[PDB]
Amino acid sequence: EDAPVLSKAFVDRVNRLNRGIWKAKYDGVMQNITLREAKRLNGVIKASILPKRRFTEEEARAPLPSSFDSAEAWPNCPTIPQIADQSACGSCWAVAAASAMSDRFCTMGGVQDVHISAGDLLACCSDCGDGCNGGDPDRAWAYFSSTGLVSDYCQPYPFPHCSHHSKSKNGYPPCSQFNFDTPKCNCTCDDPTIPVVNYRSWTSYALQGEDDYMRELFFRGPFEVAFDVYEDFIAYNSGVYHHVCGQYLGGHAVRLVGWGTSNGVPYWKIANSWNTEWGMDGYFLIRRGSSECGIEDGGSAGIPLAPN
Ligand SMILES: *[C@@H]1O[C@H](CO)[C@@H](O[C@@H]2O[C@H](CO)[C@@H](O[C@@H]3O[C@H](CO)[C@@H](O)[C@H](O)[C@@H]3O)[C@H](O)[C@H]2NC(C)=O)[C@H](O)[C@H]1NC(C)=O
Numbered sequence: 477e478d479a480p481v482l483s484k485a486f487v488d489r490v491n492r493l494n495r496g497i498w499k500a501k502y503d504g505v506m507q508n509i510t511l512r513e514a515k516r517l518n519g520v521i522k523a524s525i526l527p528k529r530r531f532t533e534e535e536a537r538a539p540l541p542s543s544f545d546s547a548e549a550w551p552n553c554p555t556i557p558q559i560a561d562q563s564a565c566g567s568c569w570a571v572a573a574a575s576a577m578s579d580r581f582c583t584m585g586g587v588q589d590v591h592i593s594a595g596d597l598l599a600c601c602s603d604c605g606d607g608c609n610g611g612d613p614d615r616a617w618a619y620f621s622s623t624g625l626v627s628d629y630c631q632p633y634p635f636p637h638c639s640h641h642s643k644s645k646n647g648y649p650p651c652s653q654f655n656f657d658t659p660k661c662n663c664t665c666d667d668p669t670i671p672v673v674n675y676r677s678w679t680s681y682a683l684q685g686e687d688d689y690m691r692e693l694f695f696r697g698p699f700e701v702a703f704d705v706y707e708d709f710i711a712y713n714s715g716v717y718h719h720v721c722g723q724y725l726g727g728h729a730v731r732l733v734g735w736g737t738s739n740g741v742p743y744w745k746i747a748n749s750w751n752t753e754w755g756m757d758g759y760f761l762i763r764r765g766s767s768e769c770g771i772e773d774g775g776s777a778g779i780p781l782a783p784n
Pocket residue numbers: 595596599631632633634635659660661662666
């Protein structure tokens with residue numbers, strides 16, 4: 477449990493079972509992560525309480541391109557290419573939700589650059605689950621509708637950037653010296669001289685399957701998906717992931733941003749929440765079409781309401 481997840485032996489058998497479609501790395505940023513540390517990162521816990529997306533006749537007939545990138549589609553939205561760090565907490569369900577909400581304020585909500593507070597969601601939605609011990613993406617978006625959230629400016633994410641590297645390029649403190657509990661729920665801003673601006677959605681819905689994902693992304697931008705994390709994913713470095721090896725570590729929520737083809741392999745482009753040192757500058761590609769690790773089973777999304 478305090479034993480390391482990864483080994484040269486493990487990674488070498490992954491690089492041979494995956495046939496070179498993707499690349500795993502032993503001596504990368506997660507070389508020393510413990511089973512306990514890797515499990516904590518995967519905080520999705522709990523058919524759907526949200527109605528299924530209904531596309532209009534016009535949405536349904538759009539001929540979707542062979543490849544798509546949200547940052548390229550909305551180049552005046554600076555939150556889309558930013559990468560989150562959940563830190564040493566099982567908060568992915570809240571961090572992925574808040575990231576896509578920020579993005580959607582720019583693609584739909586008439587607001588170029590607001591960061592919705594992951595920390596507010598994590599601490600104040602007890603409906604959603606148990607904070608840093610995990611929660612439900614679906615209920616995160618229902619809370620954004622029913623109650624609303626404050627910005628990052630009002631309540632900064634309480635947990636600092638940390639590295640699994642013992643000597644980090646960005647100089648962050650090691651994640652090994654940290655084990656955080658659910659923060660206190662606050663009504664006003666951390667700095668009491670900053671006034672509270674409340675942000676709310678008017679509707680929340682669910683996406684299921686490949687067509688739902690591409691069509692929703694194309695019209696309205698990034699949203700929250702979840703998948704099963706296996707030990708081999710922790711060592712991911714490049715290319716299009718598919719599970720070949722290792723035990724289940726839990727469910728993990730991420731932000732979907734695009735799709736494409738790499739040498740005949742169809743993929744999703746995804747923003748993880750483990751900072752820019754991990755994977756492809758914080759992104760990974762995963763196989764598209766076969767619900768790889770269940771990634772196509774359930775997305776969560778909503779439409780933000782323009783302020784004043
Ligand atoms: C809601 O309000 C409280 C503040 O009343 C926030 O909790 C506080 O979070 C800070 C981190 O910004 C904690 O400070 C840290 O303390 C540890 C040692 O205890 C130390 O390693 C660091 O140097 C750091 O200063 C603070 O202890 C904690 N206080 C209490 C009373 O809980 C909370 O994070 C806010 N909620 C949200 C969603 O932001």
